[PDB]
């Protein structure tokens, strides 16, 4: 009849009491590394943040731990405010995640090719993903393609989002728009291999957009106004048909995995963009 959950803790004791730490590297991210690490006690293998530990990260995990209670985003196992250089630190463990990036696992699909069916299931989760902050008043502000991964290389293996390094509080022109953006742009790299270019006219290839419903062509629009109204609020992303129907979507094929096979090299570049696009707005 009631229902509550833990409330986010800061560990004191020293890391290396609870786990076993590698130096073997995972990601690469903002403030340092991210090392695989073993949990002592069960033996899992497990993602660790570390932080400076300022006012600010502070409050960067106190939303991550809050939103890691939900399916489609990474969650926090443990947190660790310990000492390293001489620098009150601070150790975030959360789950291991062995799929990579959201892209960089479609061009190794090995069997057939990619499916507007696909494409939105994709689409689909990493919407909900973005609800649940926006349904608690959490802005990501980050929702780049190398923040999204995978739990396993199975194709039943599902994908989590990553990186407060950027949420912020929608508390007390706007903000939890970025978010939206970034699904509209993920979408447009999903269905054909690239994004718009500048630093705003998006024009639609011939082997690529074609036979593709204006009804999909639709979305993508709303999402990538140049705006930041009209950009079509999740709450209202999650109402139209193609995401919310799950499997009703037509097979038509998509090149996207070959497309991406096509220059691979075009990738650092795509990558900072990304961030130049994001990051900086506002
Ligand atoms: O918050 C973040 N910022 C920097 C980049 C970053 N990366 C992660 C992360 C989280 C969970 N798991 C992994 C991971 C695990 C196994 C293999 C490969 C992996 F990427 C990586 C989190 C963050």
Redesign the pocket.
Known sequence: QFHVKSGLQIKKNAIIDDYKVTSQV??????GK?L?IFNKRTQE???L?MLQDCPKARREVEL?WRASQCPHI?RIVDVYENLYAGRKCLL?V????????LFSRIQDRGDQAFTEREASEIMKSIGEAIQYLHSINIAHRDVKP??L?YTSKRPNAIL?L????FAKETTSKYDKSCDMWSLGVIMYILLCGYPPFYSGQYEFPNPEWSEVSEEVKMLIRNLLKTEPTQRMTITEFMNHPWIMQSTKVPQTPLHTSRVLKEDKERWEDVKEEMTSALATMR
């Open positions: 995972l990601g690469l991210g903002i403030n991210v695989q293998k497990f993602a943040k991550h990474v975030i959360m789950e291991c995640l062995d799929g990579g990036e190398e923040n991964l989590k990553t990186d407060f390094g």
